[PDB]
Amino acid sequence: GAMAPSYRVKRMDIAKNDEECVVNAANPRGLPGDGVCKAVYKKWPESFKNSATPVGTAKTVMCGTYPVIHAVGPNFSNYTESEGDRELAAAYREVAKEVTRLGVNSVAIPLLSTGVYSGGKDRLTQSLNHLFTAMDSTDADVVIYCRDKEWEKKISEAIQMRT
């Protein structure tokens, strides 16, 4: 575990993270996809061998010795708000299990279901709060990756509010 487990946020490509493992915002079929998933496919293509897994689950595949945790958030275009919320919470719980099992001291994580799976809504708070619910009981350093400047500020504020 980390000496003083922390949350941080960075605005940059998760494919250039400085952590001991990465969470992919995967699709259920293990396809290259777009957004975070396409950057992850370009950086760690070996990790997409038998990475297909259902919505609300996470499946880890090693790229060399570097773990890629494929976490499948719901597409809110297809799910009801209620069922979507349940599956998004579940995906983050399965990430916490994998991070714990791997014995890593740090993990890079995107906000699941906030991009093309958002069903055109702002889900920063919803997705971040499910991330916290899952990860608060782990002792890995968590580094949240985003691309938008206003998102960076809102995620930073939410982290510092608890401190």
Sites of contact with Cl ion (CB under 5 A): 12-13, 115, 117, 146-148, 151
Q: Judge whether 1 is annotated as a binding position.
A: no
Partnered with residue 123 across adjacent β-strands are none
Q: Which is nearer to Cl ion, 67 or 84 (CB)?
A: 84
Q: Which residues of 109-133 are buried (b: 16+ CB within 10 A; e: fewer)?
A: bbbbbbbbbbeeeebbebbbebbee
Query: What is the distance between the alpha carbons of residues 30 and 22, in angstroms, rounded to a whole number?
Result: 15
Q: Judge whether 50 is annotated as a binding position.
A: no
Q: C-beta of 12: minimal distance to Cl ion in Å? A: 4
Q: Which is nearer to Cl ion, 28 or 115 (CB)?
A: 115
Query: Cβ distance 30 to 12 under 8 Å?
Result: no
Q: Judge whether 103 is annotated as a binding position.
A: no
Q: Judge whether 75 is annotated as a binding position.
A: no
Q: Which is nearer to Cl ion, 55 or 146 (CB)?
A: 146
Q: Residue count of the chain, please give it.
A: 163
Q: What is the side-by-side order of every strand in the sheet holding 22-25?
A: 7-11, 141-146, 106-110, 22-25, 66-71, 58-63
- The residue whose Cβ lies closest to Cl ion is 115
Q: Judge whether 115 is annotated as a binding position.
A: yes
Q: Judge whether 117 is annotated as a binding position.
A: yes
Q: Which is nearer to Cl ion, 114 or 138 (CB)?
A: 114
Q: Which is nearer to Cl ion, 27 or 106 (CB)?
A: 27
Cα-to-chain-centroid distance, residue 123: 14
Q: C-beta of 59: minimal distance to Cl ion in Å? A: 17
Q: C-beta of 29: minimal distance to Cl ion in Å? A: 15
Query: What is the distance between the alpha carbons of residues 72 and 78, in angstroms, rounded to a whole number?
Result: 14
- List, in order, residues 6 or more apart from 161 with CB less than 8 Å away: none
**Where is the binding site, in residues?**
13, 27, 35, 115-117
**Where is the binding site for ADP-D-ribose, in residues?**
13, 27, 35, 115-117
